[PDB]
Amino acid sequence: FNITETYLRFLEEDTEMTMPIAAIEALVTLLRIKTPETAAEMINTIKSSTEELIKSIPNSVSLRAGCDIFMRFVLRNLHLYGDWENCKQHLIENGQLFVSRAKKSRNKIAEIGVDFIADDDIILVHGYSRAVFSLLNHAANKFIRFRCVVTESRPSKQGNQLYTLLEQKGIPVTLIVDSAVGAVIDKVDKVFVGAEGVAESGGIINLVGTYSVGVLAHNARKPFYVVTESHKFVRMFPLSSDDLPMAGPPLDFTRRTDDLEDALRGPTIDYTAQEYITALITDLGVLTPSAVSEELIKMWYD
Amino acid sequence: FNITETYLRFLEEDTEMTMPIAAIEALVTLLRIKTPETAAEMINTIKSSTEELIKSIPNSVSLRAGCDIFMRFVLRNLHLYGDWENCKQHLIENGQLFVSRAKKSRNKIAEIGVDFIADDDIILVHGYSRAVFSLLNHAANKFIRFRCVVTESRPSKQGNQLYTLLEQKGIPVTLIVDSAVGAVIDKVDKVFVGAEGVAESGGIINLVGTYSVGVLAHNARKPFYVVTESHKFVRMFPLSSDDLPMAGPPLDFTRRTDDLEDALRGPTIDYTAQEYITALITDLGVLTPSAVSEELIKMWYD
Amino acid sequence: DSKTVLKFLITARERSNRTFTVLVTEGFPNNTKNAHEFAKKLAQHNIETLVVPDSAVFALMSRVGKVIIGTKAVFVNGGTISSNSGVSSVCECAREFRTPVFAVAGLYKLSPLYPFDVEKFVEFGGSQRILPRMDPRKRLDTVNQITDYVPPENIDIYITNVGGFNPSFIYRIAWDNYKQIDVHL
Amino acid sequence: HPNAATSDVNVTIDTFVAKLKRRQVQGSYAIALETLQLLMRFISAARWNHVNDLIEQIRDLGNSLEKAHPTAFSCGNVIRRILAVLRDEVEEDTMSTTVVAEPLISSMFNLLQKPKTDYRQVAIQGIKDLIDEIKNIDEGIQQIAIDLIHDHEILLTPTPDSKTVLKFLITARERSNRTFTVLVTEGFPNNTKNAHEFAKKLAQHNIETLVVPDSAVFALMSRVGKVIIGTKAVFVNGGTISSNSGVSSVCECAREFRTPVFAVAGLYKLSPLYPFDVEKFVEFGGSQRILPRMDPRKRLDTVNQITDYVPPENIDIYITNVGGFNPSFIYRIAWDNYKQIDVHL
């Protein structure tokens, strides 16, 4: 039946439902076919499937986070000690239900937690997340004199795409280079971030250039923020300042080649420390200070 | 007798002598026409030529620096207060003499500058200056354990060009994006940056990013470097965090668009302070503490 | 200003063998009288008094050991709103010179609302107690605020009835007596 | 260039070399004195006729000395100073022989354009001048020194190895109305005994000494006020070579704490060449002094060093016999004592 196939199914469209939610839905669909009453035929198979998915990954992180969350939910479910049928039914219901919830969470984020750009506080943004864009688009109907600043995105010109999404709302924008990132920290108020995950350490698992940005923010004391829908607390620890579960090579010193070939293995993923989140915007209340870690503890009861 | 034409001369050719050298030569040639004897005829004309050059100038201050240096030299010349012919002859001589000098300066550099290489210490080269490349290429003649690291620069694909010149001599490398360079804290041992201008406080004008690099170096305590010959000296000191004469744009929040026309707008050229740099590279013996300001004092006296 | 902070100080001073000297900033707009009163109270008990101008903290900070506040409102990400005048700059100075910052706190005094902008929570003050006469006010523009906000980047402990807690942690404390539902009423 | 010419004309070269290699020579001052004496001997005896050739000879000698020993900087410095002394006089002479304008004392533009006498006595006098300079640094420092530190403040003291530092401390301690508490770090495999001696001296001097294990710096830093380096040599971009062990870490700590770092030295200690490396300059001790045993101690490859290098950044002031200078400024002081062509022999 496959989760991989389901994942493939959505690509051209998307741009609405959270990825981690689609994956969860797929998992649920996979489950509700082969009898979810028994725990011997099922949980192990689910785990195997997850492993397979992990193996098959090109360059995607949050899947694991999603699946572990799902597992946790499942575990939580069968503590009521009543019967096998009702609980199973509830579990089955809770896949589509979870997907439905994501939209509500997004709504909550974009109507309560959008008071971080109000007094024309110019926004230096990097990391394309849906939530960040959703909040920005929802704040365009209030006309609170907002202004956008874009540091260029170069995995393969996502920057262009981003600038094309801000042209539908009609708002003055500007191209920024991440070498002249020391140059302009002046008129721009704060630095806001989209990402790929939040760590057990606290810091952010992100993209093509982030640690430098963080450093600069620290230097300037103009606060550094991360904005997302909350379900990216993967069981991972970046213990070093140049280590994570990485898809590509970590700085591959290529051999003495000839005609401009092996070069562009430029780090498309980077991370900065725990003493960098001035605030983190999440749908489970606006909570940050040691919140992720607390949540993890609550989950694993340790 | 024209200077703009001369300037437009060297462009795709080069690869022999420093640009600011050709301009200086041109200036000298112009000088030996309207007589250095008649000070009313000559100095005014020189000034006019300089103004013309300025008018024709896009993204530079180095030509200006060169011509003012030349003027200063000329002024110094007449201090023998005797016969008005010998001095003139000397002035005439001193243009191709300047050109000749560069070679000698380079030679001087390739012996004192090769004292620096430490056992297994990875080098990163910023900007496009001939001198830095020469020093790096001259260090391979003594077969010293080292390494080179390229950065993805964006003016007219400079980084790519740089990485294309290091493959000619056969030298293993890896490519680093300007955003991604944050993670570079220990593995590259020493941070080198080439200078298109050095003025009063040992502050530097180059390309699409220097200040950020400097900041990063300061954060990691890794040593930061300024690498050139000796002709790039002006009487300058900037006002804000960064300030320069600009033919390009200083932060254009570009007007409403939907089809792509004009948006490529931000700080193309960047300055760095005094505190960030630990070592200065010139042919002027070995100096970096405060030889720039003192040099200027010696020259101008004003 | 408070009766709490004063009492705390008094309790410490009772053990007079414990050696501590008190520097007190006057607090320009409103705190002045209150500061004076505090000083008087200290004198009453026999506690060593040093009266401080607000401009002069950079000249004192390198000699300052420990700093105690007596705030009005405690917040989410760690910061506070204190009962008026001269706290932001002080905190900045402390951060620069690296100084320990105590704060007398209470959980009922602690608020679960998050402060996100200077543009709202900071409460401004009256020009009435600055300069008499109103004809010079036609051209010039007097700027003054009563109660001030602190970023958490600076303070380090909150000495409560429960215990001293970390600013990048106090949210948990609040939640051990408050909710996420009772926020936007 | 070998010792082929220098035989029954000058002998003591070999002795100097011996003193350098096996370390019968001890302390930079003594080395400097030795070098001065050598120079005197050279002058009283050698045969000239010319001047440029003599200069060349001197350069060669200097080079040879450097090749014999690098860590002795004072030796080099004094030679350089004497060369500079000679050079100015030579320049003066040339002007009379031939028979000029400059905005200040020296020029960049005079290097671009085309530019028998009693110099020996002047050379002799130069050496004497140098000797005199060497004689007293402290008697030109304690006027810029018993100024910085105050009452109820706290000092932190690494490197009690430079004889100058101790003297400086004691001059400050002299005053009957000034009071300060002194924290002293040990420095283990190269400095312990010296540190102990210093502590003893402090105790004798009737002042509040505090003995510190090299670990326990962090448990006291809240109260710390000042930082003093016991340097041996000083260089181009400001920085210093130090009289061994337990200075770098403490300096770093101070920098982190932003607690002021002072440098006390001298201009005979001042050198006219860049420390492009620490490796080529700073030398290492003896692995034997840490641990006993030998056959299990082929496995126990232990690392320990004598001298210490500190980057220009952490240190802020260099109070001299001349006066207070800065890491940004000290280069010009060097230039004021040794000339432009004398940098490279």
Residue numbers in the entry:
A (entry chain A), B (entry chain B): 4 to 305
C (entry chain D): 192 to 376
D (entry chain C): 10 to 108, 113 to 128, 147 to 376
Paper text:
For multiple rounds of initiation to occur, the GDP on eIF2 has to be exchanged for GTP. The structure consists of two eIF2 molecules bound to opposite sides of the eIF2B hetero-decamer.
In two of these maps (B and D), we also observed in proximity to eIF2γ additional unknown low-resolution densities that could not be attributed to any region of eIF2 (extra density in map D). Our reconstructions of the eIF2B–eIF2(αP) complex show high mobility and flexibility of eIF2 γ and β around catalytic portion of eIF2B, while maintaining the stronger contact through eIF2α-D1.
